[PDB]
């Protein structure tokens with residue numbers, strides 16, 4: 001099968017950025033260029049663009065890689081990328097926008113954080129990196145400056161950003177490059193031999209700060225701090241720690257363990273007692289979402305692409321707040337995936353809610369029933385349901401299928417503007433040279449009403465609307 005993934009939709013456009021976007025204001029300025037809030041000139045929808053001035057050939061490939069990395073990441077606590085434009089003088093990297101600002105500013109405002117708030121935040125950050133490390137990718141510059149809150153809501157969701165220092169790592173070899181930020185750098189990075197557990201240390205520093213308001217490793221200036229850091233000794237001796245629970249500190253000790261091999265992993269960090277620190281969902285919304293997932297029947301690739309496009313790229317965060325809640329609770333381990341058992345327990349948990357008797361359950365029947373949902377829903381055939389996949393399938397088709405979303409999807413697909421989606425255009429969407437004669441055949445056979453060899457906007461409409 002041609003594997004449907006959110007990242008395939010992000011392509012090198014050669015349309016003029018200016019033709020479709022207008023700048024609203026500066027969000028931040030770098031050495032590279034600036035990050036600019038932009039609006040789609042036609043829909044008014046807002047995005048954040050990272051604009052990079054050119055100077056020659058070395059610069060580009062290094063970037064193409066930051067992009068490719070970001071395409072492969074499809075996770076609720078990781079930055080979402082929509083597309084990228086290149087100019088004679090510039091690169092534009094268009095992406096979703098998180099308007100809540102840097103967790104850094106929230107820490108300078110709020111000063112301290114509740115055990116509840118901190119746990120939710122660190123759990124999310126850890127889920128993001130657990131996923132990353134599962135994909136053999138290490139972030140390497142984690143800090144509150146590089147964590148954005150989605151919006152100005154009180155308990156806003158977190159996004160990890162700025163993968164410009166991130167890289168692939170192999171468990172065979174070790175990394176040597178010194179990369180990170182003073183307060184948050186792991187001692188092995190200074191030493192020159194490191195692996196993914198540097199990210200754990202960084203996040204461990206973050207946690208310490210969230211709870212107490214101060215960094216665990218301090219000093220008068222950068223060099224001083226790096227000396228302190230490198231010796232690794234830290235204290236819970238400040239008065240503010242008296243009012244934090246022991247389990248939180250236990251987690252921190254394990255995350256700031258000096259010796260990397262004795263340091264807890266991201267994956268195991270998620271399972272710590274403290275991280276379930278909490279303080280519900282309406283049954284109707286849960287019921288509908290479950291019913292939508294059960295009723296999703298697999299389909300030809302063109303529909304699968306279209307739906308995934310609309311779900312993964314064209315829904316907003318505000319639309320998916322309900323869905324986001326349900327997903328996170330069905331993800332018992334927090335790893336950013338729904339697996340077979342988590343799905344099965346979702347159904348069971350719903351059954352408890354409904355008064356349906358548990359013992360009654362035919363475990364084998366349910367298992368088979370879950371296997372088939374996963375088969376239908378798992379767009380990329382990786383055996384697991386990612387966030388985007390979930391949203392696509394679990395949102396009420398009439399809502400996701402708003403008239404605007406449909407029309408915009410079709411326009412994206414009909415790349416040559418001919419009013420009709422060709423097999424080559426379908427190949428283009430997947431990121432593949434051409435489509436299997438058989439898979440294209442499987443499409444027309446179900447969708448091509450005129451019988452003119454392509455899918456026009458009305459044929460497209462029927463296709464999803466059934």
Ligand SMILES: CCOc1ccc2cc(-c3cc(CN4CCNCC4)cc4n[nH]c(N)c34)ccc2c1
Nearest residue numbers: 027028035048050066093095096097098145161162
């Ligand atoms: C290869 C493409 O990489 C990209 C593309 C776009 C990006 C945009 C921002 C961005 C930046 C800022 C402002 N930041 C300046 C840098 N320090 C963090 C604050 C706020 C944002 N809200 N929503 C955003 N998306 C913001 C940050 C990193 C990005 C990386």
Ligand SMILES: [Ca+2]
Nearest residue numbers: 335337338339
């Ligand atoms: Ca999971």
Ligand SMILES: [Ca+2]
Nearest residue numbers: 378380384386
């Ligand atoms: Ca999947």
Ligand SMILES: [Ca+2]
Nearest residue numbers: 414416418420
């Ligand atoms: Ca066409």
Ligand SMILES: [Ca+2]
Nearest residue numbers: 448450452454
């Ligand atoms: Ca046709």
